[PDB]
Design an enzyme around this catalytic site. Structure first.
Site, PDB file in Angstrom:
ATOM      1  CG  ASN A  39      31.268  58.427  34.205  1.00 32.06           C
ATOM      2  OD1 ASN A  39      32.167  59.452  34.147  1.00 32.06           O
ATOM      3  ND2 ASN A  39      29.981  58.813  34.288  1.00 32.06           N
ATOM      4  CG  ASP A 104      31.033  52.498  33.741  1.00 32.87           C
ATOM      5  OD1 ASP A 104      31.790  53.244  32.956  1.00 32.87           O
ATOM      6  OD2 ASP A 104      29.935  52.944  34.193  1.00 32.87           O
ATOM      7  CD  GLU A 128      30.126  45.840  39.421  1.00 36.12           C
ATOM      8  OE1 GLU A 128      29.065  46.584  39.189  1.00 36.12           O
ATOM      9  OE2 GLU A 128      29.957  44.576  40.137  1.00 36.12           O
ATOM     10  CG  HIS A 281      30.905  50.300  39.295  1.00 37.43           C
ATOM     11  ND1 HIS A 281      30.377  49.348  38.688  1.00 37.43           N
ATOM     12  CD2 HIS A 281      31.158  51.412  38.771  1.00 37.43           C
ATOM     13  CE1 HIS A 281      30.091  50.186  37.440  1.00 37.43           C
ATOM     14  NE2 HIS A 281      30.712  50.995  37.618  1.00 37.43           N
TER      15      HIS A 281
END
Length: 302
Positions: A39, A104, A128, A281
């Site tokens: 996301n 993610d 991440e 990220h």
């Protein structure tokens, strides 16, 4: 990463009665590589990494349900909804064993699919990823001082996402995730074509629902009890799994600052780490050449 275009072949399989776009490139055997985005991304996320790999492997990069160029079936978009739609896709493509390159929220599905399908996962390249957040002083943690401020901001940011109406104003009406959080998560500047690409699957606030559900599905604090239990579950699996591991990191990192990646270099068995240099990220957008170079390299001996 200069790489700005998305030239891949426009494939579409059908899943639980619903269309799902995906990227299929590469010889069309050996052991297929699944790139699962999180996301608020899409296949566009893996677009400059995949070309490093296709020369040798079959790269498949699904667009999560309700996400990207897939169909927007009308649903709440919990986490099981996604769990469902992948699992159906994977069988839909009839792919048997895989290597997994997962980001993610794409790693929650990834690790969950693997913990349930161990002898089917030939390897795991990650970056991440979502693991259990016991408390907040633990979210976006860091032991570097100059960065204690940034983690707080972020902590407060996700604070808002998880609260009654402001989640929906921010994420949904004001498209927080796309318009601030995403470009937020990339160290270098993000061109408008790159944005339009990420924006595109999302021009209707009525559609931003998943970019909202994700933050609230986040296993922070033991909330929501249910997701939590499956993240404790696959991080427990992972921690014990022989499968060779590739984990990529960045300074200052985010969900995985440098302290953890170093920890996880031993915490997880059979695990090589790679340093992609400055990154936040959305690593794919900072140093995607390296990420692909080292996937390419890491594969053959699997």
């Amino acid at each position: 990463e200069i790489g700005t275009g998305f030239p891949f072949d426009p494939h579409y399989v059908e899943v639980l009665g619903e269309r799902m776009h995906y990227v299929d490139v590469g010889p069309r055997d050996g052991t297929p590589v699944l790139f699962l985005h999180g996301n608020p991304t899409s296949s566009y996320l893996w677009r400059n990494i995949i070309p490093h790999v296709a020369p040798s492997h079959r790269c498949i990069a699904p667009d999560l349900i309700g996400m990207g160029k897939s169909d927007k079936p009308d649903l709440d978009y919990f986490f099981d909804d996604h769990v469902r739609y992948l699992d159906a896709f994977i069988e839909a493509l009839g792919l048997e064993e895989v290597v997994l390159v997962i980001h993610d929220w794409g790693s929650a599905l990834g690790f969950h699919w693997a913990k349930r399908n161990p002898e089917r996962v030939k390897g795991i390249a990650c970056m991440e990823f979502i693991r259990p957040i016991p408390t907040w002083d633990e979210f976006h943690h860091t032991e570097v001082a100059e960065e204690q401020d940034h983690a707080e901001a972020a902590r407060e940011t996700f604070q808002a996402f998880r609260t009654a109406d402001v989640g929906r104003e921010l994420i949904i009406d004001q498209n927080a995730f796309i318009e601030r959080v995403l470009p937020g998560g990339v160290v270098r500047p993000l061109t408008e074509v790159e944005m339009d690409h990420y924006r595109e699957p999302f021009l209707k606030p009525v559609d931003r629902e998943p970019l909202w559900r994700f933050p609230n599905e986040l296993p922070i604090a033991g909330e929501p009890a249910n997701i939590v239990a499956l993240v404790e579950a696959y991080m427990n699996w992972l921690h014990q799994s022989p499968v060779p591991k590739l984990l990529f990191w960045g300074t200052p990192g985010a969900l995985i600052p440098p302290a953890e990646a170093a920890r996880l270099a031993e915490s997880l068995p059979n695990c090589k780490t790679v340093d992609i240099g400055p990154g936040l990220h959305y690593l794919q957008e900072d140093n995607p050449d390296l990420i692909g170079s080292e996937i390419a390299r890491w594969l053959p001996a699997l």
